[PDB]
Amino acid sequence: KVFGRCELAAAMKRHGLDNYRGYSLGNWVCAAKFESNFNTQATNRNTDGSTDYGILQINSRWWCNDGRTPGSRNLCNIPCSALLSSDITASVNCAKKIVSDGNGMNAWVAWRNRCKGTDVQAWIRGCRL
Amino acid sequence: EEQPRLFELLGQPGYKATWHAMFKGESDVPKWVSDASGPSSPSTSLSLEGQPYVLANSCKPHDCGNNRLLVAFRGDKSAAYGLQVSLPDEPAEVMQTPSKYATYRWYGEPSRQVRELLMKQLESDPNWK
């Protein structure tokens, strides 16, 4: 599923991501665009040898288990396939664990390099949530 | 089970071949395009003028929204065609009028019909206004 911009913003808000850990809703939408273009079914074979899953491209080396990544820690305690659902619940729940792991959203290099310090509200501006 | 993603299709000799041939001629091909890198969701099937095609997608790692690739593989593995779409990092009017700032590059010398097919696929994006 490829979410509409406002559609995703609303879904993330319903799942309590707005202001979670001090991060406004705009930060999450921005990250998802750069990482997956809002595509819940996108997977990427990353530069570290593992696979990134879902709208927030969460990797199988540390966060979810796909049974194909040596040394997997499955910190989110979930199969990576759950991160490909049209229902973003699993992706949000894991994202909350990632952002609470001690480094905030810097865990997403795309957010750190492309969203951090920008007018993130621009990603929800006009959605009338 | 999900339709194969780009990298999985390229695992078959037939598709890998049409894929390689597709770049014969073009120059300055982006590395992420050349290596078929980045996030990819399951491919789709479609027919054009009686001929079956398999449509795959990919995008630049961590810059997915602004850098996408759509590929139309001929079902009889006779040839492949691609469309690379580039958008500027101006998250303002670009966010609401993508087509107005987008740059397109074609691979494989696609016919007018195949070009229409690929553009229509790009336009299927909920956020492509």
Swiss-Prot record, chain A:
Its EC number is 3.2.1.17. It is found in: Secreted. One of its GO terms (cellular component) is extracellular space. This is Lysozyme C. Belongs to the glycosyl hydrolase 22 family. The gene is LYZ. It is an enzyme of class 3 (hydrolase). The active site is at residues 35, 52. Lysozymes have primarily a bacteriolytic function; those in tissues and body fluids are associated with the monocyte-macrophage system and enhance the activity of immunoagents. Has bacteriolytic activity against M.luteus. It comes from Gallus gallus. One of its GO terms (biological process) is defense response to Gram-negative bacterium. In the egg white and polymorphonuclear leukocytes. Keywords: Allergen, Antimicrobial, Bacteriolytic enzyme, Disulfide bond, Glycosidase, Hydrolase, Secreted, Signal. One of its GO terms (molecular function) is beta-N-acetylglucosaminidase activity. Substrate binds at residue 101. Residues 1-129 form the C-type lysozyme domain. Monomer.
Curated annotation (Swiss-Prot), chain B:
It comes from the Bacteria. GO terms for cellular component: periplasmic space. Keywords: Disulfide bond, Periplasm, Signal. The record marks 62 as: Important for lysozyme inhibition. It is found in: Periplasm. Disulfide bonds join 59-64. Belongs to the ivy family. Strong inhibitor of lysozyme C. Monomer. This is Inhibitor of vertebrate lysozyme.
